[PDB]
């Protein structure tokens, strides 16, 4: 199963609420950041709760995206990688603070549009819940803002520089689904 392309979802994460320092960590080098696996983890939790130890099998909506809990069960390669969200310049983090975030999508099949859409819908579920905490009482609300999509098709890595297309910045997740459709090369 060859790789057809990468779809990077770059953007900004903003804090509506203050945050102490599981969700927000302070790097070994002193840098403030939100660990990618934390973010991705809460997205797993919500995206799995809205479908009725994370899920672990080959064929499934959630397990094709985030990958199964065990590596002995991978039928198809993992499609999503959530980069660590580092704090941008201009114990508790003040509200209004911005973390530049990046989400990498590995597209192998032409039906993985709905996987990306499922992840973005997960982000929408997280936008109106809480980053830190789980289940009954979460803490620190979060809002996604300024989101661009970048397409790096197989033809881009092979040498074609202009095959790399980039959508323009949208203010919310809801506007992504259109900008997603306006970008599909492979």
């Amino acid at each position: 199963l060859t790789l057809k392309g990468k779809v990077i979802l770059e953007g900004i994460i903003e804090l509506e609420t203050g945050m102490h320092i599981n969700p927000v960590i302070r790097d070994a080098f002193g840098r403030i950041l939100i660990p990618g696996s934390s973010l991705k983890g809460k997205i797993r939790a919500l995206l799995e709760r809205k479908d009725g130890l994370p899920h672990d099998c080959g064929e499934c909506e959630i397990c094709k995206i985030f990958g199964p809990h065990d590596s002995k069960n991978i039928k198809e390669p993992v499609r999503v990688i959530v980069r660590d969200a580092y704090l941008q310049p201009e114990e508790r983090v003040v509200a209004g603070s911005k973390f530049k975030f990046e989400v990498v999508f590995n597209i192998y099949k032409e039906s993985d549009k709905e996987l990306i859409k499922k992840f973005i819908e997960g982000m929408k579920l997280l936008e109106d819940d809480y980053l830190g905490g789980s289940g009954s009482r979460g803490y620190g609300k979060i809002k996604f803002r300024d989101i661009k999509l970048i397409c790096k098709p197989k033809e881009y890595y092979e040498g074609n520089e202009n095959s790399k297309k980039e959508s323009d910045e949208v203010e919310s997740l809801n506007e992504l689904e259109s900008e997603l459709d306006k970008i599909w090369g492979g």
Binding site: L1, D27, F29, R31, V104, Y157, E158
Partner: protein, 311 residues
Amino acid sequence: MKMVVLKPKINSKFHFKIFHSNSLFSAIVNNYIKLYGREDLEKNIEKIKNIRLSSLLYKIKNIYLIPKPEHPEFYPKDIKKIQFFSIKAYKELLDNELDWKNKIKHIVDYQTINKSIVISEKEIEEIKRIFGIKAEKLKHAKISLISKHLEQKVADKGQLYNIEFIKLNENVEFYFLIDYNNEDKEFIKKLEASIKLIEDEGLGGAGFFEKVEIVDLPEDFNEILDENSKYNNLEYKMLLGVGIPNKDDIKNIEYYKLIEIGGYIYSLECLTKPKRNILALTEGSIVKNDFIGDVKDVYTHGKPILLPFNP
């Protein structure tokens, strides 16, 4: 022969001593498999295993760091701290425009960065320009090129171990030399694609990049590595990557250093089973005539790009 330049992302940090060329090979191979499948690789394994690589070296704008030649000529006892030579400075050691023997104090006082990197006189002023150094001597200037930090992680019970994280300065980039040793365009483009995928794939562990670009060798490297030049007849050569010798190159090895390449400790089940390791010559080892190399077998690349050397 082409140069690959990797510009690290802004808040990126790496986990890998330097990043050896066999790890680069494994990266370009996992990327080849990722782009073209596991089948199309073993239809070209005999042509990817015959590429020549250098290890992951450091680039400062137009200054290219190369390992220090492990020749005894380069031995108070402060000279045991240096590990790098700018390619220009290294070239000046060939044309005798730089005198190691009787001018070491001028080199150590006016031409060495962080007591570990020797450069040329013609690079001093731009080094001072970049990092805002006003000191008349470079001896009196500690430049923050990399930031190291060990961390205590576990493999919660099991084995405790340390992992060293490296952070690069905004003016510092990675680079490595690649020799395809071939001309099949349909293959070259897929090697360069596998190399270019690192941009979003990363190195180590992962540390990601903002741009991975394949360009032609800078003019020092090209004026040195061109086989239609003087240096071609130089009788010794220095490894720029790890070297895994075949039964024939063992008679060409003069001064060298050994390191052990190998595997993961996939369990505790294997704490009863022996640990077979692959011996290799470190970057900077000197060999006479020509070093061919080998690729053990998961692949372990040991064919290093050689760089003409004269004592």
